[PDB]
Design a protein around this ligand. Structure first.
Ligand SMILES: Cc1cc2nc3c(=O)[nH]c(=O)nc-3n(C[C@H](O)[C@H](O)[C@H](O)COP(=O)(O)OP(=O)(O)OC[C@H]3O[C@@H](n4cnc5c(N)ncnc54)[C@H](O)[C@@H]3O)c2cc1C
Length: 260
């Protein structure tokens, strides 16, 4: 349930990317966040208590603190969202030493073990996972990815990740993903897509643009049953760019398609 965490440290991974390390009040504990679930960092900004979901990037076994990879939505940055992000600017504003209120565990998805899943109460299993995401929608996915690989080589669940962004300077857990991809070729397949190539000179070898059926066709596995699909991305993307294409790839939308 509710827990009071102090912001122990902050890290600027890039102009708009921070890594915040929060301490739990009892230094001998882990944040027992079951895989597939998130926490709410609650805070009262101005006059309302804001509630935002975040899925930590730290090991399930991390004693004493948990980390959040937060993509800061600054103001004076977007045509349509001129005043930036609420909670993200609030957290970026916090000086280290400050207190935060985490509510958890929330969620409907849980990765109980080996291919096994617990969605909205029901229990299921999968052998091939189709993880399609965009931006920070990667953290929920990176939690399962870390779980499966941790349970290696017994939990040999097959993962196919399609990670979409806008720039190569925007791929979040890149090195981590590249690093794993090299180690567990059999387990995880990684494919990036990017709206633009900031430094094409260096030679971008993945897809350029948006998520297309041609991309899903060659990077997500075949639909059917025993092939689960999980997706966490902005509304329009889940919308236009994903569900129809996966429908076209014969994935039962109901019993086989989930969004975080
Ligand atoms: C399961 C789950 C896990 C999540 N995990 C994480 C996580 O691990 N890490 C993480 O960082 N995020 C995560 N999120 C995202 C989180 O829900 C927030 O919505 C995100 O923090 C932004 O919140 P905010 O209060 O700053 O924005 P809000 O004030 O709610 O506004 C968001 C909207 O404004 C737009 N916007 C405003 N300014 C800009 C700008 N400068 N550039 C681009 N768009 C702009 C955004 O595009 C978005 O459409 C997760 C969400 C869920 C559902």
């Amino acid at each position: 349930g509710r827990i009071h965490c102090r912001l122990v440290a902050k890290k600027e991974l890039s102009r708009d990317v921070r890594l915040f390390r929060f301490s739990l009040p009892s230094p001998d504990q882990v944040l027992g966040l079951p895989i597939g679930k998130h926490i709410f960092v609650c805070a009262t900004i101005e006059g309302k208590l804001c509630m935002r979901a975040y899925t930590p990037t730290s090991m399930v076994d991390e004693i004493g603190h948990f980390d959040l990879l937060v993509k800061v939505y600054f103001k004076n940055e977007h045509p349509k969202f001129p005043n930036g992000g609420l909670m993200t600017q609030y957290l970026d504003s916090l000086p280290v030493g400050s207190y935060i209120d985490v509510k958890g565990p929330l969620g409907h998805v849980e990765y109980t073990g080996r291919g096994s899943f617990v969605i909205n109460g029901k229990q299921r299993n999968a052998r091939r996972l189709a993880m399609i995401c965009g931006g920070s929608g990667i953290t929920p996915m990176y939690q399962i990815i870390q779980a499966v690989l941790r349970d290696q080589p017994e939990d040999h669940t097959e993962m196919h990740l399609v990670y979409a962004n806008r720039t190569e300077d925007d791929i979040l857990l890149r090195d981590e993903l590249d690093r794993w991809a090299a180690e567990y070729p059999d387990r995880l397949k990684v494919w990036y897509v990017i709206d633009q190539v900031k430094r094409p000179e260096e030679g971008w070898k993945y897809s350029v643009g948006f998520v297309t059926e041609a991309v899903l066709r060659e990077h997500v596995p075949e639909g059917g049953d025993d092939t689960l699909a999980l997706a966490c991305g902005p509304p329009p993307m889940i919308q236009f760019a994903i569900s129809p294409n996966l429908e076209k790839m014969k994935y039962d939308m109901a019993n086989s398609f989930v969004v975080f």
